[PDB]
Design a protein around this ligand. Structure first.
Ligand SMILES: *C(=O)[C@](C)(CC(=C)O)NC(=O)OC(C)(C)C
Length: 500
């Protein structure tokens, strides 16, 4: 057993600050006090152990058994993450082999409000979830190195040389606007309990820059106190969970129709008697007191029969292509942990049943992020700007995925869906023209997807509410009023001029 030893040891680096887009702190590394011990030294001072046990709130017997069972080790933790006062209280006992060191611990000042986006670090300040993990290399910095001389008990007797200084991690500014994030968090929360709903997500996106301005989910958790949390509570559902978008994808079906050369908005479809058999299967409308509807009316009344007949005429392939081009069932490139691509199925032959289901948004699966990104492209005159979770100063070129005229026509139809008699009037945003589409999917999921202001769009938004429990479960009743409140608040905070 050696009389001395020499060891190159790590100098930990200070982890980078995560901020919102305006520099509001979301994740900050602050010094906590850690007490550790060298048992080989403790073993020389047993009369001090009970005083030490007491100061640590430990039973004297269990503490003594712990030191005895570790008699051959040079390192154990006593307690991690005290205040300096708490440290100095123990250090005042002057117990041999007991030492304090300051180490960095993440604090999350907004806690539950941004937990799913920001994620968290382990006790070693390593990014283990969300942005903390996705940008770990950026935030972590580079540990330094130094050479210590240790005596026969592994006690540090000299600092010989520093070979490398630590390099701190880098500041990261998210795209999130904490002001919009708090507004969404609170409104989605108020909505959940108003409808006795299980779970929900809300996404707000900048249609010009591709930036995620808000991303909230219920349920949530306090990342500063992760003791006894539900595993459900930690899911970033907006990126992690996939659902059938139902009627919210009808604007893409319609984009394919207006692009085909075969359809204009004042064209007519006969949807009487509100059902359509195709062999074994029957397509069914919620409301079944219509015969002739124009394409705008097909959206206002959300007629499954109407969108299905259009889809038969233009063919599923045209609709599939629009949905693929606006990013449905495609990688976002965000690289967020557990992030889902979902499923936009393909066929060589599209039979009539698959053709109809695709057109009204059954048999495909998307994330809330994806559905928001598609509404952003439609709102941005058919140009998709690539998605960002980080502040965008230099906006990359977007890709024209829907012709500008077709996008402009579908925008106007979606404004009528909100503004017209029989429309989703609860989605109306006071002072503004707004546009979007309600959806309901299967126990129900309640959807609203929209953008505003209609005259020069700035913001796309998706509200998803899981299993509302009141007699009203339609997207137009459950999700639309949340869209209204949050869209109103977000446009005021962003100083967007009233267009109505
Ligand atoms: C759209 O979401 C559709 C396809 C039509 C609509 C009500 O907006 N959803 C639908 O038909 O929902 C149920 C009634 C659950 C089938």
């Amino acid at each position: 057993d050696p009389a001395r030893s020499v060891r190159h040891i790590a100098i930990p680096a200070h982890r980078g600050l995560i901020t919102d887009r305006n520099g509001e702190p979301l994740a900050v590394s602050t010094p906590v006090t850690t007490l550790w011990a060298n048992p080989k030294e403790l073993m020389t001072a047993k009369e001090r152990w009970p005083q030490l046990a007491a100061a640590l709130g430990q039973d004297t017997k269990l503490f003594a058994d712990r030191i005895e069972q570790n008699a051959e080790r040079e390192f154990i933790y006593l307690v991690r993450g005290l205040t300096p006062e708490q440290g100095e209280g123990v250090i005042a006992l002057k117990v041999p082999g007991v030492y304090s060191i300051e180490e960095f611990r993440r604090f999350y000042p907004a806690g539950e409000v941004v937990a799913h986006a920001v994620g968290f670090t382990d006790v070693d300040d390593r990014g283990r979830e969300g942005i903390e993990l996705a940008f770990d290399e950026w935030l972590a910095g580079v540990p330094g190195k130094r050479q210590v001389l240790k005596d026969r008990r592994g006690r540090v007797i000299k600092d010989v040389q520093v070979t490398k200084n630590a390099k701190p991690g880098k500041t990261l500014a998210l795209s999130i606007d904490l002001r919009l994030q708090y507004l969404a968090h609170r409104e989605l929360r108020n909505a959940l309990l108003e409808n006795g709903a299980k779970a929900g997500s809300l996404v707000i996106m900048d249609v010009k820059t591709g930036e995620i301005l808000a991303m909230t989910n219920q349920p949530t958790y306090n990342p500063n106190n992760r003791r006894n949390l539900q595993p459900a509570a930690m899911r970033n559902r907006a990126m992690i969970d996939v659902f059938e978008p139902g009627s919210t994808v009808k604007p893409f079906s319609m984009s394919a129709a207006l692009a085909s050369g075969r359809w204009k908005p004042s064209d007519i479809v006969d949807v009487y008697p509100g059902t359509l058999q195709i062999g074994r299967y029957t397509i069914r409308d919620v409301s079944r007191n219509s015969r002739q509807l124009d394409l705008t009316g097909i959206l206002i009344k959300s007629s499954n029969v109407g969108i299905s007949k259009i889809a038969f005429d233009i063919g599923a392939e045209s609709i599939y292509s629009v949905m693929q081009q606006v990013g449905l069932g495609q990688d976002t490139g965000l690289g967020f942990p557990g992030e889902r691509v979902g499923n936009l199925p393909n066929h060589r032959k599209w039979p009539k049943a698959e053709t109809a289901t695709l057109a009204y948004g059954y048999g495909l699966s998307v994330t809330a992020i994806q559905l928001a990104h598609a509404y952003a492209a439609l709102a941005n005159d058919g140009k998709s700007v690539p998605l960002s979770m980080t502040r965008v100063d230099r906006v990359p070129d977007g890709v024209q995925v829907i012709s500008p005229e077709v996008a402009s026509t579908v925008q106007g139809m979606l404004q009528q869906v909100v503004e017209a008699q029989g429309g989703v009037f609860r989605a109306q945003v006071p002072g503004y023209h707004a546009a979007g589409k309600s959806g309901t999917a299967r126990a129900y999921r309640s959807l609203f997807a929209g953008f505003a202001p209609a005259t020069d769009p700035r913001i796309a938004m998706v509200v998803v509410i899981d299993e509302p429990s009141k007699a009203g479960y339609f997207g137009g009743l459950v999700s639309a009023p949340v869209f209204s409140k949050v869209m109103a608040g977000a446009l005021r905070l962003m100083n967007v001029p009233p267009d109505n």
